[PDB]
């Protein structure tokens, strides 16, 4: 069936005040179908509060409005984020990659998920010894936000625990 619609949400701050329900739909239309768009507004002047959301139809959709980033919505550009179960950070904690997990088996993974700046595989201060856990770090928070929604990571044949990092 489709997914859980929280997870094809994306939270749009930075409006400009002038964007509407209808002039965000017409923008975010342009990567999928929406079934929700809303400008926030106080209740009693109507004016914008400056952030608004939209939902997609599928979170293929989230991803390619994400990935057509940096969105310009009636002039201004505007910060679309994903919702997690928002702490916006670009590394991540990966746990229960053993002594066998080599940089490339995290790297090949990982990279399909967002740009790849850092791969910290931590090894033991006194001996060297690989301590079994590693930091991933991204160039932008979206691939972070796609990780830790997922209930699996299969990494080298392991089964890792994955969460943000600091
Ligand atoms: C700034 C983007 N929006 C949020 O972070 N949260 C929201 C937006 C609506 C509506 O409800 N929560």
Same mark, same amino acid.
Request: proline share 0%.
């Given at each position: 069936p489709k997914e859980p619609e929280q997870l094809r949400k994306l939270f749009i701050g /930075?409006? @400009?005040? !002038?964007?509407?329900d209808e002039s965000l739909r017409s923008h975010f239309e342009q990567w999928g179908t929406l079934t929700d768009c809303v400008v926030m507004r106080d209740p009693?002047?109507? *004016? @914008? *509060? /400056?952030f608004g959301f939209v939902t997609y139809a599928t979170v293929e959709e989230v991803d390619a409005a994400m990935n057509a980033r940096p969105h310009k919505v009636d002039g201004r550009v505007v910060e679309p984020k994903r919702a997690v179960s928002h702490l916006t950070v670009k590394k991540i904690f990966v746990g229960g990659?053993? !002594?066998?997990?080599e940089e490339h088996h995290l790297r090949d993974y990982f990279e399909q998920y967002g740009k790849i700046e850092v791969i910290e595989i931590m090894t033991d *201060? /006194?001996? =060297?010894?690989?301590? =079994?856990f590693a930091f991933v770090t991204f160039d932008d928070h979206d691939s972070v936000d796609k990780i830790v929604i997922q209930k699996y990571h299969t990494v080298n044949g392991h089964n890792c625990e994955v969460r943000k990092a600091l």
């Open positions: /930075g409006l @400009s005040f !002038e964007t509407t009693n002047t109507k *004016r @914008s *509060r /400056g990659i053993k !002594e066998d997990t *201060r /006194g001996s =060297g010894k690989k301590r =079994g």
